[PDB]
Curated annotation (Swiss-Prot), chain A:
It comes from Homo sapiens (Human). It comes from the Eukaryota. Disulfide bonds join C10-C15. This is Insulin-like 3 A chain.
UniProtKB/Swiss-Prot annotation, chain B:
It comes from Homo sapiens. The lineage of its organism: Eukaryota, Metazoa, Chordata, Craniata, Vertebrata. Changing P25S: Found in a male with undermasculinised genitalia and intra-abdominal testes; uncertain significance. The chain holds residues 25 to 55 of 131 of the full protein. This is Insulin-like 3 B chain. It comes from the Eukaryota.
Amino acid sequence: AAATNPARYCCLSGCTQQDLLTLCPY
Amino acid sequence: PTPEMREKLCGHHFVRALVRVCGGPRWSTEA
């Protein structure tokens, strides 16, 4: 279910509160 | 104020948004 490195991935393209909603440790 | 515009989150942006969005570890530290 996991993906690549979100920090890098969003840096090039970006991430929605959805992505970030699932990237948080909660 | 500003929705999920999937803007480029380069680590830090990615950090703040990560929070703005959900939060993260604690972000307290000095709190």
